[PDB]
């Protein structure tokens, strides 16, 4: 705060007028424009995050297959023996993590 | 503030009707008709001493200033700084208002070219180069304003003056004047430009004259009187011939630069009337015979291995060598402007071709109508 | 609930960047969009409002729709950077007009000039007698630096409506020193 | 405010506490649309997952022609089948695991085999780590048991030169306890 | 960087019907609308499409109305009844092109960077030519010549999956140029 005074010390008339300003009107006049596109973008993207939770809502539906999972591998893949005593494979698993599965 | 023009009135001839019109322009606020005046003072040729005595008011100007074009702001402070001749303390000035402006107005790309153009006279090699680099860069997605890349060639105009810069300079040199437009500005600064240009595309390695500078009005309508030898020299390459007399007699009139590479012009045009000699029939016997080139390009016998080995290197043709009967063979693929004259020959070619094609398919469709069906 | 399609036409030339109105000339007439499109709803849920720039091109940004609040967040980085150009900002609002989705609403043009326009009193007095053989009211209304009353402006606004048309106003504006409530007194009640 | 020391020092002293209030919260909403492009990520990636279809296991039995092949499912019937574009036609042996299509029910993709878990013992037990430098006083064995063993597949050149083939493997014989598993670790 | 785009025969065929929809109104000579796509290499594929309202004067020829809105739902809604489709570009017909598609592209290549354009003949389908496919590049123009926008061209096919031959193979049942030809269909070839 020895500069806060210090330079109100030395240059009286030539950036009390303009070093107050310059640095705080580019300052106040990028928050007013960083203030409403971030706001904005973020109410448009909870609406999107919506409306796709909505989307997996109705296409994950009851009833289910069950099933075992026989090993993993991944080129996060999957090997699933079915209790239909059917043998698929998947490349893609789904609504759940490869790593927190386990045969 | 106002009397603070009242008391720097002096200097501005016709002082009521621009100095107490500016008073009112700036205390209703308004900051174009305002930028316009301003603009009108410092593009005013005098000595304009009060630079010192406007930046004051300029940095009163970035005072209450809040809505002011950045890009006129720096197009004026170039002047400015132009005018206060001292390169020192004239970089931290223009660093300085560089960095006011770093938002979406891309003026900071013509503050890089303001500093190179300040520093391509002192300390000239170790960030210049830097500072031709960042603004290509920086110019992208956007062709519109055109000074920016009007500036950024002002720097590589400066950069001539390096050893290793004449091609790449005279492809430049195309950039500009073809991104510039208008002439605007006499003929006693462009007839010398089209004389660097000419001189640039003489020393470029790649280039051989590249025609349709020849058509290219900023040469032939600006040194139509004077410096002919030039344009009598590119007529001799562009029509190939050796034509020693005048091909010697731009050597008597360029004194500098051109006794030291005179070796590189014989090397040049005689690997250019290939590229005619070629052109002349139109590959009903391209078998040329040794002797024509030595005939034409005279050079000696034992060098136009060397020479047509030379050319297909470069490859501007794609032929090849018998030595048996020591004929070329010729299959040429380097094609260039054909002087509307020729047009018309090339106009009979293509009608003599669109009837043979339309003929004998009559012929048979005539003949096997029945099964045709 | 008298149906209508309003079609709002703002600046941002470069003559917007400066301070005859005190706050910012921009906030000026951001503010009057803001008391014209709470007009335009609050007297009819059923109506529709579309912007139109006329700096440097006519752009459509949001379309004639009843919607406000993509017209509230258009109105935010405007970007005053253009050159007026204002023969085409008429045909751009008209033929914006002619593709409406319920086509028994009638026609009306808010326009907001504040900058110097610069034409031929020739081509508006065809695009007058143009709207006279179309029937939409243009309502004209003066900001920034104003020219106040060219023979370009008294003359488009006579031929809009002549014999006793509608009354389109014309509305001048004191450059600077005093608010919208010139601007709410005549046109937003009686056109 | 034009220049008192103490009123242009209380100028920005009101300005300094506004500027800094705005530019506060600004990060905040930097992080809180960053977090939400994070979930958003994974919402997509969700929208890419639910459109897989799934795949049949089978297995190679012979092949026919060029693109005439014999596959059999892992319960169900035998079929004829070919490939997709590029899957490489000759990696694909008779005995190889494959991926069919649901409902084309050609090759997709073909897979390796991992069977018969007493085999699986490899993977879970350790290579060591010993270096010859745990193994006590058997040098003279231990480097006998490297020219035969470590040599041929670290450096078949000097095979070469003399002329000669062996990677053939030794016998360990000796009283137990001594040495007959560590030997056999360190070179592993 | 495009090798070739793959027109799936309903899009064209989906242009057709509607140019056909506003020709009992038709005085525009032209269609615009949107075309989506798949976008899976250098090559490029085209399966659906859609249109949009547009109009464009003879006069001045550069006062012209792409729906930003209109485009914004329909496409999503072709989004949440398919989500493997998102758009790649536009189309339109009258192959005397006007000159007001560098207008048409530069605005809506803000949907899509590589945006792309592909001209149908509706009414010229007669000689050698099925569509037409053009891609915007900018440079200056050349070394020493001024600025310029020059659309350039990618060649153009048609494509084939299966459950559309079958639509194709049912539909013909007249001549159809039957399969592998006999030693008339091969002289027709060369004629
Ligand atoms: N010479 C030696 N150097 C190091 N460790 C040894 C030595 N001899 C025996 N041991 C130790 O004795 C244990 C038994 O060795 P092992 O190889 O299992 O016996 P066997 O050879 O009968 O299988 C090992 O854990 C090893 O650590």
Redesign the pocket.
Known sequence: EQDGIGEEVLKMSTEEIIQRTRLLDSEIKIMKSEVLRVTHELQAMKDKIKENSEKIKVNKTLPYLVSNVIELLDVKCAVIKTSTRQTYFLPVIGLVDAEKLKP | VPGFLQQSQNSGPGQPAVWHRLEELYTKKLWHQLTLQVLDFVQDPCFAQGDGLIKLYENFISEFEHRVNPLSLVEIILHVVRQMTDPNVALTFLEKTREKVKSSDEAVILCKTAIGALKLNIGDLQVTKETIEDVEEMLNNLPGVTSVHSRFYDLSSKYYQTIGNHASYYKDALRFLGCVDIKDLPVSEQQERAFTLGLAGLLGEGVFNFGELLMHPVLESLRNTDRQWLIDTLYAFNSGNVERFQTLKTAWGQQPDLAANEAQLLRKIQLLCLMEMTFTRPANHRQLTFEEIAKSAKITVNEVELLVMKALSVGLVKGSIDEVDKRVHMTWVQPRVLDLQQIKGMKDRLEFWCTDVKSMEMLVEHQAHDILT | MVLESTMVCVDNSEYMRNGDFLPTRLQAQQDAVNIVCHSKTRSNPENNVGLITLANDCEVLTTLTPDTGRILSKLHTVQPKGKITFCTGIRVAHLALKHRQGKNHKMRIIAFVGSPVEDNEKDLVKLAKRLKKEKVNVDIINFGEEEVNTEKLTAFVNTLNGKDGTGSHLVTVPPGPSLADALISSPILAG | MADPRDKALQDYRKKLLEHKEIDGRLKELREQLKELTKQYEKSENDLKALQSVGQIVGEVLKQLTEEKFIVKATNGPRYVVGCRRQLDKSKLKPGTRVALDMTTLTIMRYLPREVDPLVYNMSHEDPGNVSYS?????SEQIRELREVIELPLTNPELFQRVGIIPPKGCLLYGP???????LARAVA | AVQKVVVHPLVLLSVVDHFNRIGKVGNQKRVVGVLLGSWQKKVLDVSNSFAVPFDEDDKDDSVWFLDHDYLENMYGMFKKVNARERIVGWYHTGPKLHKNDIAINELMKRYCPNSVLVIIDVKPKDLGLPTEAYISVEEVHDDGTPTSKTFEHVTSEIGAEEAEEVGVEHLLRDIKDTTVGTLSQRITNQV
């Open positions: 745990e193994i006590g006083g058997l137990p306890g001594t040495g007959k598993t560590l």
